[PDB]
Amino acid sequence: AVERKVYPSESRQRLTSYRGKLLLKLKWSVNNGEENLFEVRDCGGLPVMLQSNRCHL
Amino acid sequence: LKYICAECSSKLSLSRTDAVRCKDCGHRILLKARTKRLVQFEAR
Amino acid sequence: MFEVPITLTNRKFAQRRKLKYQYINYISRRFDRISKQQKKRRRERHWRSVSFEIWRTVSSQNKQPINKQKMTYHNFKKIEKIPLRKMEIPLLHCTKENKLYFQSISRGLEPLKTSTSEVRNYRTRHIVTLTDLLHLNVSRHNWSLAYKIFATLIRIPGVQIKSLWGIGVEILDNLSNSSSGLDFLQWMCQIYSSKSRSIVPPFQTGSRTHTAKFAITYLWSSLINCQKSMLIDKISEWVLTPPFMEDAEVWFIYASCHLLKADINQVIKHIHYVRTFLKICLDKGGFAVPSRLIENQLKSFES
Amino acid sequence: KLIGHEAKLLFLKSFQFILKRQIRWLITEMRFPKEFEHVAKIIWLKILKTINDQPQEELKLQLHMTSTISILYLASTHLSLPVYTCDYIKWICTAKMPYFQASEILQLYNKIALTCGMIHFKEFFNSEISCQGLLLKLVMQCALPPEFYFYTKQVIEFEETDIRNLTLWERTDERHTGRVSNHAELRVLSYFMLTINWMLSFDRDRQYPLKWILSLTESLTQRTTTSESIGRNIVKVVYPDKPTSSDYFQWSEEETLEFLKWMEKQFLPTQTDQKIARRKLYKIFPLDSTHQLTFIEDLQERYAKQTPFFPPARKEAIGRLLTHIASQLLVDFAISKEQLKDCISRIKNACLHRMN
Amino acid sequence: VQGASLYCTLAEDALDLHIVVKSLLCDTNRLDSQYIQTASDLRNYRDGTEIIAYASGKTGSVLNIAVLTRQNTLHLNRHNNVTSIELHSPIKSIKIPGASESIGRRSNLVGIITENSFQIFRIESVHSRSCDVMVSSSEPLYFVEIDDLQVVDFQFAIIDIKGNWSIGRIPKNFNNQLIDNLHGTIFDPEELSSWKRIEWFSHFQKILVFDRSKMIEIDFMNNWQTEVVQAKAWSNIRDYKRIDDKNGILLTSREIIIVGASESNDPVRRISWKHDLDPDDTTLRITVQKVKKPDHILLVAFVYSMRHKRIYMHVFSHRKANLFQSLGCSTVLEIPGGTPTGIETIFELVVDFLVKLRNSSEVYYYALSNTQNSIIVDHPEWASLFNNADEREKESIGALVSQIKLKERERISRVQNLIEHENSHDEDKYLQDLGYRLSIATNELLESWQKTKDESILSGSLSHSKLKNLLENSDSFASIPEFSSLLDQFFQYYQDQDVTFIGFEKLLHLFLHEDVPGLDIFYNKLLQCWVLVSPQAELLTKEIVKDIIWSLARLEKPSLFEPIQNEISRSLSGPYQDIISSWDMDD
Ligand SMILES: [Zn+2]
């Protein structure tokens, strides 16, 4: 469902981390690029510094 | 009306085994509103 | 006489698709032989590939060579004769109408009733008229009535939102009274962009791979709300929350945001910027015939 | 959670409950008599007692919505009220009389004969149909002049001699050429058609010229908004067979307008986390000197539109009038083209034979 | 939008529609819930001679009746589109399509004629002079294999039959007959439907072969084959017809309207774009007409069905530099009870064509304009009802027509005098002695309702609702308001309890569909309506308000005191849990 932004005030009150999601574009390659596979992954929600470019604030 | 959306401030009440979230917004954190009740304080 | 925008049906049609793909499989099985369940239908339908800005097609050049007759009469009826019988078994369990249906589709006839035509009933025939009047009034530029239609439609507990361009043009020529246009568009996008089978897509869809309608439509139309100017850094900040990031065309939307911001060393970084996203949109997709036009423009800028 | 194997009781209690709900709405909103209720408690009492004098976990129960309507009609007809099946069809298809759900979110002729054998019509109730108001309903429904009420009333007397009943019921199901078209109303409609056809196409005193058949046809054909015609459009939308849906294709902007009116009124009688998400989702885009004229107004003005009252291609005019009439009847009395013409066919040979 | 703001919210034009202009032209188990695969009529200008001459608009039609015939004749155009005099010739089998082609202005704008059929495939030549037409059947070929050819495309006779195809050539004029080489086949065991189709694309040796699953580009005279870019998934190829001198293509697939066309010279697709128009109807065909102007070149897209006579239209335009856009759907009907087998074509728009309909040997020129500045019923099911007559059954019908005609005379002259007496002292005498006359009989039946009350096995007593056997009783009054007053004072009279009670007004509601308080305003309303018409209104309207008020006269069972008796006496014999199932006043 269409996601909502998370403001740290929520993270404080819920006593959770304030984290952004971490994403990796991963090249799975076989035989020196003879065959390769691009697949994006998620390594988990990553804590984010407040008032930074990834902070909604 | 015991409760308040921690976000949109919308007043609400709940029930037993009810989704905890703002029926309007859906924020799953809720506040307990203060109601008329007799509390004593000394002015000292 | 137009496609209906509700989930087709329950009924027979499943058992018909059963008969169809089951028989299909028996014939194709014996056919590779001689060349040497929802799930049966699933594997069956499965093993098969599933001066202007044209998403050019893939043309013929490295493709294949010629074949020469496979199928006389006496030899086709070979492959036909057995699987038709195995079909004689569960045909014994489907209904008369679908006996005759399978019979005829197997003779190679083609039905001249539709799944809509034969799904009878007070309520659906009413929806059929409601939606017709919708499509008609919208053809007629009768945006007011049209709107009334659309509203009573979506009110009905059956219609899925497959009629959005319905509003996206309807509410669009209806400046009058209602939040509209972009309202609907970016609404659609925000709601149907996450996790939060048939009866589907190209103009509706979910995540993990791309989503024509809502996405590209708000995603240009907001840039048209900036041709309303002569906003951008917003559209490109939240455009600048990928990833699906294989949405190459959205890469070109991004580069467009930069050519519109470009319209001092700031303006430099904006033209540097568009120069970058145009080729990261050589990702692939395929737009803009000569990027040297985009770049001749970028030199009119470079002045 | 839910009852087992003897929820026969809860079944009969939502059924009984839903019936009484419908009666509340027909005495209240349709100004029926209070007597209807006791008439209904009696009939549904009779058949409740008969299923509870064949009650067994080896259960054979078939209480359908059709049964509800069947006992309303059954009871009305003992009471000789001038209500007819088509009243009921209009009523239920218009979401006015509650129907088309189990408890909203918080074949008729055949089930009336079926119930009509289930408990016996003959020595418990009076199952004469209220014939003459059916005639009046019918002449007014066309714009036929009041002579045709007596015209048909005559042919009626001629074949039947005034007597009309409700069972063609012996439990049997294998029926062919025996006892079918034995539900009366259908024969009345058949007679009605026949009358217009003989009567017109054979009055050599043709008081009725080469052309007023046409003007009749056109004043019949003119789509014009009253409650009634609007209704028949609303019925047409849920009638099984084409052409009667090509019809909504051919509606006039006024017809479509009173349509959307009825739409937003009686689809506030609509049915049926994400639920409130669509409560808001829909409440984003907005749900929301008297003009159009009454029945006898329209009726008057077509009677006048023919008031210039004072040659085998008139057989044509006869035929298209008949077929238009027919169509209105098919949607109005929920039957098939082929059903109707089976009946009028049978009973027209039944009139030739008892005159020839 | 796309180009206008690439260049750095509404349509180009205003709201255009669609009008008619019509003319007459030609006039020639148990399972029809399916249909075969066939088309069946052409009209095209072709060059007969070419000793510096022009083209002549020809029709090739089908006399059928008994299946098997072929018609040719010229049509002088101007505006009212006609013929002169006919010329005809059959073949021993059934015609499946007549087609006649024209490659465009690369060349020599000419043709001749071709047609394909249930077990035979033929091609004809023609010469013509003085308004007679003389054509000339270059030999058939009965079906070499016992197959059957879907489509012909066309100096190259190309056949397609249930998968496998062949390029081939026609003879020059005489006896020698038509050969082939370079064959091939598409084939797809899982294509149950029998139709496949072949048509040129670009011009030099690039064909398209179709089945309701896929689109196959085949470059013969090289060796080449491609499955284009969709197939066999969410939609069916429903039709394809080639637009444009050579390089244009129009494909109907479910709701997508697809314009393909050329690029890189040969051999290409277009994912330029499409509109989507809305069914599941296997029958659906398309045809294009083209018109010109300086700033565009527009294609009008006709998608039509076999199920309803609506025609569904879209419009594209061709801008010099391979450029196409669209605008908004529009759809028309025409006369009902049937559907079309031929729709075919040739600040405002003129589009014009002809249609044939299912089972009507009839060709109609049509013409459609932008604006305005300038049932033959043979329903065999019903007429078979409305005649069903020998001669003694024609006069057998006339019998009772006369019978109730003179009878209706009896009614008229009878009632007339009663109408004379409307308010006499006499009619008061009658409404009196009649009113309490009735009352005496009404008491009598109430007594033999005493004697048999103890039944309590039913609640509908005997058979009640009548004038109660006086036949003199009813008919003889004339005033309606003094008869309504009679009844109001009779209901008033038997107001002594345990009696039927019923209230007419609330029920006339069902009749005139408005509140009908008095018995009288009922007569008023009907009398307005019928005084407008055939009037003996005053009389009849009185006579039928009399029949209704009789038919409804609430003479009936003893009340409440007697329902609540059988209600409980059956409510008992039903045991137990059903004694509580018998529940009322829920909520
Ligand atoms: Zn909230």
UniProtKB/Swiss-Prot annotation, chain A:
User: Which interval of the chain is the signal sequence?
Assistant: none
Q: Where in the cell is it found?
A: Nucleus, Nucleolus
- State the superkingdom: Eukaryota
User: What functional role does this protein have?
Assistant: DNA-dependent RNA polymerases catalyze the transcription of DNA into RNA using the four ribonucleoside triphosphates as substrates. Component of RNA polymerase I (Pol I) which synthesizes ribosomal RNA precursors. Besides, RNA polymerase I has intrinsic RNA cleavage activity. RPA190 and RPA135 both contribute to the polymerase catalytic activity and together form the Pol I active center. In addition, subunit RPA12 contributes a catalytic zinc ribbon that is required for RNA cleavage by Pol I.
Q: Which family does it belong to?
A: Belongs to the RNA polymerase beta chain family.
**Subunit-structure text:** Component of the RNA polymerase I (Pol I) complex consisting of 14 subunits: RPA135, RPA190, RPC40, RPA14, RPB5, RPO26, RPA43, RPB8, RPA12, RPB10, RPC19, RPC10, RPA49 and RPA34. The complex is composed of a horseshoe-shaped core containing ten subunits (RPA135, RPA190, RPB5, RPO26, RPB8, RPB10, RPC10, RPA12, RPC19 and RPC40) where RPA135 and RPA190 form the DNA-binding cleft. Outside of the core, RPA14 and RPA43 form the stalk that mediates interactions with transcription initiation factors and newly synthesized RNA.
Q: What is this protein called?
A: DNA-directed RNA polymerase I subunit RPA135
Q: Which organism is it from?
A: Saccharomyces cerevisiae (strain ATCC 204508 / S288c)
Curated annotation (Swiss-Prot), chain B:
What does the entry's PTM section describe?
The N-terminus is blocked.
Name the domain of life.
Eukaryota
User: Which biological process terms from the Gene Ontology are attached to this UniProt entry?
Assistant: nucleolar large rRNA transcription by RNA polymerase I; ribosome biogenesis; RNA-templated transcription; termination of RNA polymerase I transcription; termination of RNA polymerase III transcription; transcription by RNA polymerase I; transcription by RNA polymerase II; transcription by RNA polymerase III
Q: Does Transport show up as a keyword for this record?
A: no
Q: Where in the cell is it found?
A: Nucleus, Nucleolus; Peroxisome
**Annotated residues for binding of Zn(2+):** C5, C8, C22, C25
Q: Which GO terms describe its cellular component?
A: cytoplasm; nucleolus; nucleoplasm; nucleus; peroxisome; RNA polymerase I complex; RNA polymerase II, core complex; RNA polymerase III complex
ZnF locations on chain (C4-type): 5-25
- Where is coiled-coil annotated? none
Q: Does the keyword Zinc-finger apply?
A: yes
**Keyword field:** DNA-directed RNA polymerase, Metal-binding, Nucleus, Peroxisome, Ribosome biogenesis, Transcription, Zinc, Zinc-finger
One GO term in the molecular function aspect is: DNA-directed RNA polymerase activity
Extra information: Present with 907 molecules/cell in log phase SD medium.
Sequence similarity? Belongs to the archaeal Rpo12/eukaryotic RPC10 RNA polymerase subunit family.
Protein name as it appears in the record: DNA-directed RNA polymerases I, II, and III subunit RPABC4
Lineage of the source organism? Eukaryota, Fungi, Dikarya, Ascomycota, Saccharomycotina
Q: Which residues of the full protein are shown?
A: 27 to 70 of 70
From Swiss-Prot, chain C:
Tagged with keyword Ligase: no
Q: Does the keyword Transcription apply?
A: yes
InterPro entries, per database record: RNA_pol_I-specific_init_factor, TIF_Rrn11, TIF_Rrn11_budding_yeast
For this record, the Gene Ontology CC terms, alphabetical, are: nucleolus; nucleus; RNA polymerase I core factor complex
Q: What is this protein called?
A: RNA polymerase I-specific transcription initiation factor RRN11
Q: Which UniProt keywords apply?
A: Nucleus, Transcription, Transcription regulation
The places in or outside the cell where this protein is found are:
Nucleus, Nucleolus
Any single biological process term in GO: nucleolar large rRNA transcription by RNA polymerase I
**Subunit structure and binding partners:** Component of the core factor (CF) complex, which consists of RRN6, RRN7 and RRN11. The CF heterotrimer may further dimerize to form a hexamer. RRN11 interacts with RRN6, RRN7 and SPT15.
The organism is Saccharomyces cerevisiae (strain ATCC 204508 / S288c) (Baker's yeast)
List the PANTHER family. Answer: RNA POLYMERASE I-SPECIFIC TRANSCRIPTION INITIATION FACTOR RRN11
- Extra facts: Present with 476 molecules/cell in log phase SD medium.
UniProtKB/Swiss-Prot annotation, chain D:
Q: List the cysteine pairs that form cystine.
A: none
Which cell locations does it reside in?
Answer: Nucleus, Nucleolus
The UniProt entry's GO biological process terms, in alphabetical order, are: nucleolar large rRNA transcription by RNA polymerase I
Entry's Gene Ontology cellular component terms: nucleolus; nucleus; RNA polymerase I core factor complex
Keyword annotations for this protein?
DNA-binding, Metal-binding, Nucleus, Transcription, Transcription regulation, Zinc, Zinc-finger
Q: Which GO terms describe its molecular function?
A: RNA polymerase I core promoter sequence-specific DNA binding; TBP-class protein binding; zinc ion binding
Q: Tell me if Nucleus is a UniProt keyword of this record.
A: yes
Identify the stretch(es) annotated as C-terminal cyclin fold: 107-202
What family name appears in the similarity comment?
Belongs to the RRN7/TAF1B family.
What is written about domains in the entry's comments? Although it shares weak sequence similarity with SUA7/TFIIB, displays a similar subdomain organization as SUA7/TFIIB, with a N-terminal zinc finger, a connecting region (composed of B-reader and B-linker regions), followed by 2 cyclin folds.
Subunit:
Component of the core factor (CF) complex, which consists of RRN6, RRN7 and RRN11. The CF heterotrimer may further dimerize to form a hexamer. RRN7 interacts with RRN6, RRN11, SPT15 and RRN9.
Other comments on record: Present with 398 molecules/cell in log phase SD medium.
Would you tell me the protein name for this molecule? RNA polymerase I-specific transcription initiation factor RRN7
Q: Which organism is it from?
A: Saccharomyces cerevisiae (strain ATCC 204508 / S288c) (Baker's yeast)
Q: What is the lineage of its organism?
A: Eukaryota, Fungi, Dikarya, Ascomycota, Saccharomycotina
Intact protein stretch covered? 94 to 514 of 514
